[PDB]
Design a protein around this ligand. Sequence first.
Ligand SMILES: [Cl-]
Ligand SMILES: [Cl-]
Ligand SMILES: [Cl-]
Ligand SMILES: [Cl-]
Ligand code: NA
Ligand code: NA
Length: 129
Amino acid sequence: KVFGRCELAAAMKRHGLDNYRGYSLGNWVCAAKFESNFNTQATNRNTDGSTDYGILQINSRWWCNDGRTPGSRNLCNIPCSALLSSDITASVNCAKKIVSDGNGMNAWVAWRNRCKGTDVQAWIRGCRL
Ligand SMILES: [Cl-]
Ligand SMILES: [Cl-]
Ligand SMILES: [Cl-]
Ligand SMILES: [Cl-]
Ligand code: NA
Ligand code: NA
């Protein structure tokens, strides 16, 4: 599923991401834009052999099981393929664990490099929330 900008913002708010650990909703929408272009099916390989899955590009090194990332963990206790569903619940719930892991949203390098220090509220401008 490819979400609209405001459709995704609404779904993330409904799931409690708006100011979760102090990150306003625009941070999450900005991260999703640059991680997946709002596409739940997005997958991308990392140099170490792990893979990133779904709308927030959650990686198989630490957070999910894809059966092909040797030496990895599965801290969200989910198959990585569940993160490609049109229902973003698993991605949001896993994201809540990630962002609570010490480094905040710096865990998403695209957030650090493209969203941090910018006017992230722009990403929800015009949206009925
Ligand atoms: Cl957009
Ligand atoms: Cl914020
Ligand atoms: Cl959903
Ligand atoms: Cl933080
Ligand atoms: Na915001
Ligand atoms: Na894994």
